[PDB]
Amino acid sequence: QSLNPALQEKISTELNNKQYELFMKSLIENCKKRNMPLQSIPEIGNRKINLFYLYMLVQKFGGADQVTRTQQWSMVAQRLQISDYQQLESIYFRILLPYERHMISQEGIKETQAKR
């Protein structure tokens, strides 16, 4: 009994990145669904769970340092629902899961050898 907000669930931006975003979105949403499933299509903001989207956003803000410099990470994180207070723990855990990380690892296994 908790349908999506349907407020900030915009899919695709230029029809080109939609493929890259949907790839990580479907993968993360699928794996994460094994722990914290949603009503149907889990989305918050405008798709930012992608390895290219989440990166582009940070670089655009001037780097993680810039986001924290003005203490905006709290607000920005809420946009993608990555740091919603205590909930950030559950989201981080599910996202750090072995299945979730594995699904995304295929796109970049070189990151695995990098270790924590």
Swiss-Prot record:
Q: Where in the cell is it found?
A: Nucleus
Give TM segment ranges: none
Q: What else is known?
A: [SWI+] is the prion form of SWI1. [SWI+] is the result of a conformational change of the cellular SWI1 protein that becomes self-propagating and infectious. This conformational change generates a form of SWI1 that assembles into amyloid fibrils. [SWI+]-aggregates sequester soluble SWI1, resulting in reduced growth on carbon sources other than glucose, reminiscent of a partial loss of function of the SWI/SNF chromatin-remodeling complex. [SWI+] can be cured by GdnHCl and by deletion of the molecular chaperone HSP104, which is required for [SWI+] propagation.
Quaternary organization:
Component of the SWI/SNF global transcription activator complex. The 1.14 MDa SWI/SNF complex is composed of 11 different subunits: one copy each of SWI1, SNF2/SWI2, SNF5, SNF12/SWP73, ARP7/SWP61, ARP9/SWP59; two copies each of SWI3, SNF6, SNF11, SWP82; and three copies of TAF14/SWP29.
Stated family: Belongs to the SWI1 family.
Q: What's noted about domains in the record?
A: The prion domain (PrD) is a Gln/Asn (Q/N)-rich domain, which is unstructured in its native, soluble form, and which forms a parallel in-register beta-sheet in its amyloid form. The first 37 residues of this domain are sufficient for aggregation, propagation, and transmission of the [SWI+] prion.
Q: What is this protein called?
A: SWI/SNF chromatin-remodeling complex subunit SWI1
Q: Covered residues of the complete protein?
A: 390 to 505 of 1314
